[PDB]
Scaffold this active site. Structure first.
Site, PDB file in Angstrom:
ATOM      1  N   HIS C  43       0.808  -1.217   0.000  1.00  0.00           N
ATOM      2  CA  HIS C  43       0.000   0.000   0.000  1.00  0.00           C
ATOM      3  C   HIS C  43       0.843   1.270   0.000  1.00  0.00           C
ATOM      4  CE1 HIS C  43       0.810  -0.933   4.208  1.00  0.00           C
ATOM      5  NE2 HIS C  43       0.637   0.348   4.477  1.00  0.00           N
ATOM      6  N   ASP C  79       0.502  -8.178   1.096  1.00  0.00           N
ATOM      7  CA  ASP C  79       0.869  -6.775   1.319  1.00  0.00           C
ATOM      8  C   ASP C  79       2.386  -6.595   1.387  1.00  0.00           C
ATOM      9  OD1 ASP C  79       0.563  -4.085   1.636  1.00  0.00           O
ATOM     10  OD2 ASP C  79      -0.108  -4.167   3.724  1.00  0.00           O
ATOM     11  N   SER C 154       5.192   2.260   9.246  1.00  0.00           N
ATOM     12  CA  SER C 154       4.616   1.390   8.230  1.00  0.00           C
ATOM     13  C   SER C 154       5.592   1.224   7.075  1.00  0.00           C
ATOM     14  CB  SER C 154       3.294   1.969   7.729  1.00  0.00           C
ATOM     15  OG  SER C 154       2.668   1.105   6.802  1.00  0.00           O
TER      16      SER C 154
END
Lengths: 286, 286, 286
Positions: C43, C79, C154
């Site tokens: 992402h 992911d 992240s």
């Protein structure tokens, strides 16, 4: 006695409850001077300094002892405030060095023990010199920490493992560095007031060069005389580089007053460089 | 093996999954007695004790073994509950001393390993004896911790560094002290029911003297006979001082039943002192 | 130098800022190969891989050095995503073993130092192999941690106390295990693409036997040929047991492609057992 249990025990008597009554509001603060100078954050006593007629700030120590308070001064631009307890013994806290703090150090976000919603949270240093948005609103070059900062430890110090103050908590947890705290408290004690630089510029953030896009320049400001226009994008103010409007408000504060300083900006994509003379925000105190 | 890794490994077999099915609800609990007595929180099995016809509480151990459950008793006023597993070997947990717990100690908020949303969070002790609001609603004199408490470790114990239970998790994280847990569990096992004091007083908080402003006194209650009126502000119940309505509900529980106790309150600003005889909330169990 | 301060200092040069500009988005990533292979989460660059015409991913190191990026491949199902920096020295990170990670270990959720909202949070391992819901949406068999995971860290790694990568952060904090990370990155580097199993089944959760109640079977799918119907409740897929729809999507990924596998389900309360041959999701890459 555990590692964090001993640190919170030594510094406990140096942490203080701060409460103004009428409603009422309560907070935290640290004892930094033997003469009775207690440092807190401005929003704690902010209601005791805008409404002095219906309020009465009091000081509750760790041993339950109460005493009146005396507002020596405050700084809403860095969210700091100094109080005074006359003829009080007094457990003076040990002040650390913010420049020696590194990402990874264990810290303790201490609050006033006798507080109603007091906390004592523990984390590490998550970031250094992080501009965070927070009486005139402002932004501070803060110490970030994963230790929770709430109404409990707000005001209290951010203590390192050597039981030394590395910052003062303010309210994913942020604290005002102790080195910026000492400088503000040393001139809030002496001069009773701090004087911060100013350029007269309203800015907005952008992420395309990025930086702080200028919104409105004050008429007669140093920026209006140095050639800064509206709609240009400030990419560096002095030796500091400006990433957004939050970092822009912090960079101007490190500029010397009166000393001509450079300000690089991009207008129409074309990179111009601009010389400005930072004005004092307090023409009567400077 | 790390510091926290060894503590969670030793106590893991003493932590248990608790689940009632019909839909369904799941939780956590600790093994505190060799006879098969498991302690949990009341809201976990609250749906298994108000709907006993469509529910069946089961016990899942760390080794995957299942077994039925047997509700020995519960206490919604301190959010505690005891279950029973007959003829089960059994890893008995080591029960700590809540009075020896100090702010700063590292703790572990353990949950049932095989749980669907199980957690194992780590923090320190943020506060001691903090009244927190939480079947009859109540408030508990809880241990606060910066370790996260959620549906996962709710029910599970708050373990110190010596692998000993200092509390039981309930659902900025709070836990019921082990010393208040043992007393409730010792009389929930023996008498099958706890009996808590009562005065018959509805109170509301105030922050001006502060305290718990009385809202409604029950007709025929001990407070109605000792002279407590409506609209007065309770500032101290017995040896405890009352800071708000949350601390007020906790202070009455420490009063001896039948023993005449003092209650200081301010009515019309004037400080009166009041003698009350705490009634038992269970006239049939006392 | 503290315990966590030394670990974050050694691995700092192995953590990288990843930013795509047009607007713009920023993230984090780790250096795992000396040839210039940087691993991030999908992402982060998801906007650089669906809009390649208006974006340009760049790589900012700890020493401020910038360099272009090159998308080697990505995996939205777990992911993960791999980037490339050609002819760059390079601080290679030390890759850990996810199977040796136990609940209780201290971890560090590192982010890119020069990032705008960078974090460095510290916690422990709260859970192992927890299916969590998160370009095609998916669910991952993640490592849970009480260390905060946000936009800052992240992308960055979840570092153990030996300064070794146990996972990669993704965005009560979750991370993709390093062992599942290496396998995906080893075939995203070589084959430029991963191929995951598939059965052609839409499922929904249930809590009554529980499991993943089947919603819609794809026409011509392996599940439609092995005898799986709609409305039955999947309780185990292969050697894995299925607790809900989140764990169901994770269990199918561990099935060998082409190898006939068992799938136990309850239809009308009656427990049937079903043989299925998992199809590849990429008929052109398998």
């Amino acid at each position: 006695a555990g590692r964090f249990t001993k640190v919170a025990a030594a510094v406990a008597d140096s942490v203080v409850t701060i409460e103004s009554v009428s409603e009422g509001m309560q907070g935290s603060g640290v004892i930094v001077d033997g003469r009775g100078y207690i440092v807190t954050n401005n929003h704690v006593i902010s209601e005791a300094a805008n409404n002095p007629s219906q309020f009465k700030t009091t000081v509750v120590f760790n041993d339950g002892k109460e005493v009146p308070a005396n507002l020596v001064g405050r700084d809403p631009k860095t969210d700091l405030a100094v109080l005074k307890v006359d003829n009080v013994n007094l457990t003076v806290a040990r002040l650390g060095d913010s420049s020696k703090v590194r990402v990874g150090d264990e810290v303790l976000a201490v609050g006033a023990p006798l507080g109603l919603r007091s906390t004592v949270t523990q984390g590490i240093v998550s970031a250094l010199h992080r501009p965070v948005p927070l009486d005139t609103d402002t932004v501070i070059d803060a110490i970030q920490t994963d230790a929770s900062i709430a109404h409990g430890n707000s005001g209290g110090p951010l203590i390192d493992m050597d039981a030394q103050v590395i910052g003062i908590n303010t309210a994913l947890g942020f604290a005002i560095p102790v080195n910026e705290m000492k400088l503000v408290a040393n001139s809030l004690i002496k001069d009773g007031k701090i004087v911060h630089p100013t350029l007269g510029i309203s800015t907005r953030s952008v992420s395309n060069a990025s930086g702080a896009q200028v919104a409105n320049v004050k008429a007669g400001s140093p920026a209006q005389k140095g050639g800064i226009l509206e709609n240009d994008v400030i990419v560096k103010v002095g030796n500091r580089a400006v990433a957004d409007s939050d970092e822009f408000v912090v960079a101007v504060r490190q500029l010397a007053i009166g000393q001509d300083a450079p300000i690089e900006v991009v207008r129409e994509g074309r990179h111009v460089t601009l010389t400005v003379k930072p004005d004092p925000d307090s023409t009567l105190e400077h």
